[model samples]
Target: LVQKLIVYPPPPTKGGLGVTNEDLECLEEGEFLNDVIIDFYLKYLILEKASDELVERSHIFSSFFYKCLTRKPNLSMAQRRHKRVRTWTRHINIFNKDYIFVPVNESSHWYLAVICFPWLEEAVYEKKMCKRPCILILDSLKAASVQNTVQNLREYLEVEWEVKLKTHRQFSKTNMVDLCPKVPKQDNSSDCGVYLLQYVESFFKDPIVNFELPIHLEKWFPRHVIKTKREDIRELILKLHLQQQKG
Candidate 1:
């Protein structure tokens, strides 16, 4: 049923526009989709869902993340607010979202990082607030690199908020458990990119909740499921391009 909505790129005009025909022909044969295509697909998918929003790649700057994660102490209230609005509005938006899908590029391979704000319930219950949050990293290769990326994020929050993250294993003094969960492993080498998008798609369809059995976990869909979506995604790119032209 989800696959049906992804079918795109209608047939070209009868025997005309060779280049357009070639483009559709190439897409049908299943060429490797590029970063721009994946970015647009994720963005469009978010737009389609009334409950979801996205942070685009152009806005995913290390500097912006740093700025949002750290602040100057001497600033007045107005100055702080101005800096947040001017430089880190999107970062703030990401922090507030219930489910955030961040695409991670480790060298050339793609991975997905799903970030959820775990503090809302505690904040509401205890009538207290916290700045730092926890995230889950899903890497196809299960490489140690994901840890480094998240560790940097954890460090940034620690410095900016002046409160140690309860999520980090290093912070044993706090009650929060380890934030990174072991994800289902992908079997193939070429499928990492596909898995990344599938991770985003699957997360929205059935979000992971705390305290579940390993077999019942919603975070890890079978790698085979992603293989099928690869073709559908190609079709989506062609269709998305046409949709753009019409708009």
Candidate 2:
């Protein structure tokens, strides 16, 4: 089969939208990253890191679920929304992959999940309800509690996979691996968003092992990572602009 050429920083002209050097220069370290920047960076990673098959299987964002979590619960409305989220998850069909990256926001803080379906399947096959067990939480604060979050996910999967969920739902105690032992931990507040992006970047760069954690990730690292990444993102935006122009 003949292959079609790939377009990197896709054409802004066609969409009547453009990302330029000026835009990239505006990236601020101390501020929280809005969805626009987060979406663009994830797109860049898919293009750069994922293999063709994996690319088709992965999802970059799912803020919709966050809304479901935060919304006040009514039994009828809650059931419908939960079912809808299940439908969304099944549509993605992430069970086929080795790794799935989910970036989540809780109130003001950002956290990450390195969801290992295959690993989970191996460990939790014994328990009929436990289909996916390994959810490695990488919170920059090293303080955010994800027990509820993980349980919600487990519940969603129960509905998605047609597993009969137990009555009187309790927190599904799955293996919530403490990644702090091997991953970078943020020193202060506010940099969690930047650190989340860095976590995604490092995970993509090397999936089998933890990325540069301690020596490079100490006090000054958050400031440095955010500063350098702005230029990095800017170049990528420009490179795509030029390539699309050429094409």
Q: Give the candidate number with the greatest TM-score.
A: 2
> Per-residue lDDT tens digits of candidate 1, residues 58-153?
122322333343355996443353445344442454334555555666556666655455344321222342333345676666655666656545
Judged by whole-model lDDT over C-alpha atoms, candidate 2 comes out at 0.55
Give all candidates' CA lDDT scores.
0.48, 0.55
Per-residue error (Å), model 1, residue 153? 1.1
Deviating ranges (above 4 Å) for candidate 1? 1-34, 49-91, 118-133, 159-183, 211-224
How many steric clashes does model 2 contain? Answer: 0
Per-candidate TM vs. native?
A: 0.57, 0.66
Q: Evaluated with lDDT, which candidate comes out highest? A: 2
As for model 1, its CA RMSD to the true structure in angstroms is 10.3
- CA RMSD of each candidate after superposition: 10.3, 8.0
> lDDT (0-100) at residue 98 of candidate 2?
62
